[model samples]
Target chain A: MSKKLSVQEIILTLQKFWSDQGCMLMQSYDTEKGAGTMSPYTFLRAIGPEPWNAAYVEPSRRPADGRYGENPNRLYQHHQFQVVMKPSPENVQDLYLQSLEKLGINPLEHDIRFVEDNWENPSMGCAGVGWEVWLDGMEISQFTYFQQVGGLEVDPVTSEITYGLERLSSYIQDVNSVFDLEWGDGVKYGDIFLEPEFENSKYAFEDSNEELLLMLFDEYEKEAKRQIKNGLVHPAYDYCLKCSHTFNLMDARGMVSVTERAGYLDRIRNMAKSIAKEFVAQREKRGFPLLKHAQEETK
Target chain B: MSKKLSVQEIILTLQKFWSDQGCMLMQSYDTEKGAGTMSPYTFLRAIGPEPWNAAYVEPSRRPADGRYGENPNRLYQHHQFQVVMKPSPENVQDLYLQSLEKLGINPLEHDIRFVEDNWENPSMGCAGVGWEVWLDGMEISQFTYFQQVGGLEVDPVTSEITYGLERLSSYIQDVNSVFDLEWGDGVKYGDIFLEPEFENSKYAFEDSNEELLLMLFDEYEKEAKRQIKNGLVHPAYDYCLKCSHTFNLMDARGMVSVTERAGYLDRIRNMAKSIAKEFVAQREKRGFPLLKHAQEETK
Candidate 1:
């Protein structure tokens, strides 16, 4: 077996591997989101027929997942190393396996399997047919071919791979608890995130203002619609993200009943669908510059 | 001379250099702010006695600086490579120079000088004595010793270096426009950011709902105060950041008069001060674990 890579090393290694594969190295979207797919880089770009490939580490916040920094496996916020390739590559699975190999994961020695796990984000009107990549009985990455985004069927499917960074790092470093994993050098993950996890969990479960969150959700929805009406897809999409996060906070606070949750999600879904439609139209109007660029490269 | 590094290479080089110096490589805080200094990794960490050294690239949104993607020099959102070290290192300047060298910048070949340029963000109640690093008469970075953060005196002051990634990349890549610089591989900066930059500028200046933004500012302020009262500093601090960004949006829309602007800034400053005080007390209660860790390392 090869030497264990630190959490940061794993990220850097993956980034380098993907970048070498013609993926643009992008920064995390500057918004609170529950998953990397919620980022415009993935969500909006996945809609239009412009050839795109990008990789980024999204700091995903799931308020409901908060365990007050006590749970060894769960966290309020976690990192997701996400890669999206439009017009799904035929040898993408091989590419993913190669990335694991680069991370010092020996494929021959370990039990590696791909289990069917079709992914869906109803709130964003997104769904994918894919599998969960498991190593030694532990799931570490989601490999998906996006089928529907923003309530619209996409032409030329986009393949997305979302790696659970902490989980993968724990397996690599042989650490049972996420807090024990070495980030890089001498810095423990606990030293940086433990406090914020505890505090944010407390706020989400106990201290967050339910009234304010509910109000903000409605306001965000309104703004999202207004921006869409103005033909500003990016701004409108940002509001949709805000609404989704606010809803998560509210749901975590136990303020929403089962029926109310559906209604709220429907609202977010409608906003997302609208934004996605506009995004496609906008790209069409711009003559799909990336598509042109890709053609030029081929020539 | 060595070949010029791409924008992404410059960032990776700097991150490697700082991480080697014992700084934790952190993700950009998932919130829209005007500067990296607003990140808890810098703002709150700079407050307490706990030793911290970290580096991250912040996607800073300065709504007021929007130029509709036409201007070569200005941008609605820009990336800042920020490094913060508490208890300012004795040879921090040398370390900064060494990082520049790592980016293939040779000090002997260019006019590299630091001109006195004290920094202040009145709204965050942060002030620093520092210099602007100029390379061949073009400003590329800010070198500062943080004297105060969140309206509190920082003991064993933190040293912060803010590198303008785009500006520095333009110099390194010999590109006249930020849009022309290569991100990495074959991707151009403009290919990814140009459309959003133009759209976000429009949203900030003309299309944003003023009434909703005003309401959001007030609600964010209330939520921040409420969170602070509940002793949840991080959550409260996040809301404070929201208020600061909302204020910027309003100011960019020409909604705030000179007097109204100061009032808004004072409100943010007060919230910052409160959060700082609570953070310090909370860290004290926890026994300042990082401080103890630093001591043990030396022993």
Candidate 2:
């Protein structure tokens, strides 16, 4: 039996499974790369004594790796299933099972396994030791035991799950190639998106304006600070994306050098830090009215 | 009466709305950044001719902007509502209105407005012109009339809707601060992820080994090329994260000088270009099985 589901159903099923396990639902600001791995939850909350479990979807865009042309698996942006459990939730394994069912997978028939592996990346300032969740030897998920986030030792540790959806779907669809997978009753994967994919690959990988972008980067930096001062912290954050995109274009065009790229990232990090500082200052001066109501729940 | 909806309800509601519009239900791979902005759907497909519409939940994780000692938004990662419409879906505004209904919002009672805005960013190698989807004067969604991605222009265009779940919840829950959001009968947001949020913030802003990271950056790049040649792209991509992270630390330390930053961008761009080139070669030699299927459908 071929089960055809819409993108919306996939999200609802996962949210139901995660929320049922005591997670408070939440969402994030739109960012350009790697989901919100840079967001405060995994970046801040994942490392401390807090109990945290929330789930939402992110687009995870990466423009520099267009492959200008690649096959099924390679893409610039892909979906990720992020699961964070606090104090190491007891049902970590089972929660995954339920989510899979929603994904149209029968737990009884498929051999789902968590192969041992430690996930760590200091370059992006993150490190975790966990396992690759696999279904019959094909790696489908990165079930990381988040030991550290933002380079801090995590306490009341949370287990993180990152599922490679399309890959798994391809596996489930019984198709070796992603484009060959049947999406629903009438749609084949490629029938809907192949032409756009080809053109996008060319633009992302083969061509992009590096010089004009460099100018934009400076403009974004200046504008972000100005907006922050203007009491538009959220709006200012948009410039960070611009800064990041410019960095990507320069990288794609082979215009930036290795040592120089590190500097660009610093600019982004600093802007974020400064904004956080201003956000706190603004609230403090206002007596943190939001916090007063917010803290009442503790009593 | 403030209606505090459960996470599952939100996801289910969103899926119903998007699927009706021909969207494939998509899920995030990990707790990633909001929207499919980073997904190959946007970054790669934006330049091409393929058409796609997917809706999914992405729980994003970002570590570099912990704001360690500042900020009021708890556990920064917010739930995202990502929608990608193709042939620049003409009834985008209508579709968005319909989605709101699924979300339990009565558009007639609630003031929903689309403010004209152009979304652009150079650092991430992306740019787009869109609107801020505002409801009752609160910025509920970022509606981008996308102009560019992967350094390419989108033709037949695509309209992207990225909604910040937490922001909307704050209003719906009648809370001023996002952390003060109430879930269900008796749960409060702070009681959930505050501790972890604080801890991770420290690591991102205060802790972490900067010197060792720089050394690791060099080591990863040295090995990145070799790994790609050996068919180890997974690890190689890890280097990309590293390159980006090292830059973050330097920014945090205030050690980065503007003049020197250009080199870092160049380095990452080179890696992306080279890796993309290699990937394309590998896929091409394989006769592009995936590309063939998707193209056939659109043509």
Taken over the whole model, the C-alpha lDDT of each candidate is 0.89, 0.60
Compared with the true structure, what per-residue lDDT tens digits does model 1 show for residues A48-86? 778888899999999999999989889999999999998
Question: Distance (Å) between predicted and true CA of A272, model 1?
Answer: 0.8
Predicted structure with the largest lDDT when compared to the true one: 1
Which ranges of candidate 1 are over 4 A from the true structure?
A1-3, B1-4
lDDT of 1 by residue, B205-258 (tens): 999989888999999999899988878898888889989999999999999999
Worst 10 residues of 2 chain A by lDDT: A285-294
Q: What count of clashes does model 2 give? A: 101
Q: TM-score of model 2 relative to the true fold?
A: 0.55
TM-score of chain B of 1: 0.98
